[PDB]
């Protein structure tokens, strides 16, 4: 049987009419450094960037990467376990975080992706209606979220 995946009902051409405040945002592992490195707090750099209440989300795969890092990145590990950061369970064998994040956004058009990886960012860019959050300069920046 042939498969033609149905484009999500949350999408009108290129604008997602479903993503709305309070936003749910997936945290990428590299985001934590450029947050710590820039002295930008996770919860509120998001609020300042998006001017809304933001619910950060750490999946098992991104989490699984973090402890593998080791003592050098303990600060990143502890901030990941801040109780304000909710946890997402995963039911796929692989621990590669980039693939897991790309799948979740493919599945449901309700997440913001917080990452600075060029390769991952390009993959998310191809997927329509996925707001992409990044940290540059002094604070966070959101590109595909016109409600801003």
């Amino acid at each position: 049987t042939r498969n033609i995946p149905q484009v999500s009902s949350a999408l009108f051409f290129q604008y997602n009419q479903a993503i709305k405040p309070p936003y749910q945002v997936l945290i990428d592992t590299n985001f934590i450094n450029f947050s710590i490195q820039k002295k930008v707090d996770i919860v509120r750099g998001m609020m300042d960037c998006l001017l809304a209440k933001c619910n950060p989300l750490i999946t098992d795969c991104v989490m699984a990467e973090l402890e593998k890092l080791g003592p050098k990145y303990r600060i990143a590990l502890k901030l990941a376990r801040d109780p304000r950061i909710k946890r997402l369970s995963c039911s796929h064998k692989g621990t590669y975080a980039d693939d897991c994040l790309v799948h979740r956004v493919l599945q449901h058009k309700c997440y913001i992706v917080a990452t600075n990886d060029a390769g991952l960012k390009q993959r998310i860019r191809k997927i329509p209606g996925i707001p992409l959050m990044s940290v540059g300069g002094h604070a966070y920046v959101i590109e595909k979220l016109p409600d801003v």
């Binding site: 303990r74 600060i75 901030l79």
Partner: protein
């Protein structure tokens, strides 16, 4: 020459933890050093430390438990107003509730949130987180 004994002490602590040493020796001593280490102890970052007099400035031997993610001094000791404190905490700490900025205020050496609660201000000694 020796300009800031406190800086040398804190640098010794950082090297000691980084190499995984459980104990480290600090020389020379100074009242500010004992107050700083007492603040660190109260926050739990550092364990027992003992003073050794020699009829000179003295020495410290401090036990270490690996809970110290970084500790440093702020030289020169800038004057800090109550309004300026949050600026310093934002600059020197990865997150405001992760770490403490230690101020020498008119009421003594003490961490920033204690200073806010007492409504006092002064100069800045350093930071620990």
């Amino acid at each position: 020459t020796r300009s800031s004994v406190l800086a040398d002490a804190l640098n010794a602590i950082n090297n000691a933890e980084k190499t995984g040493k459980r104990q480290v020796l600090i020389r020379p001593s100074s009242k500010v050093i004992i107050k700083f280490l007492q603040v660190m102890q109260k926050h739990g970052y550092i364990g027992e430390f003992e003073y050794i007099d020699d009829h000179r400035s003295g020495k410290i031997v401090v036990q270490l438990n690996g809970r110290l993610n970084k500790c440093g001094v702020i030289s020169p000791r800038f004057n800090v107003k109550i309004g300026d404190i949050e600026k310093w905490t934002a600059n020197l700490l990865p997150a405001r509730q992760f770490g403490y900025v230690i101020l020498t205020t008119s009421a003594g050496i003490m961490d920033h949130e204690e200073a806010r609660r007492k409504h006092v201000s002064g100069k800045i000694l350093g930071f620990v987180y």
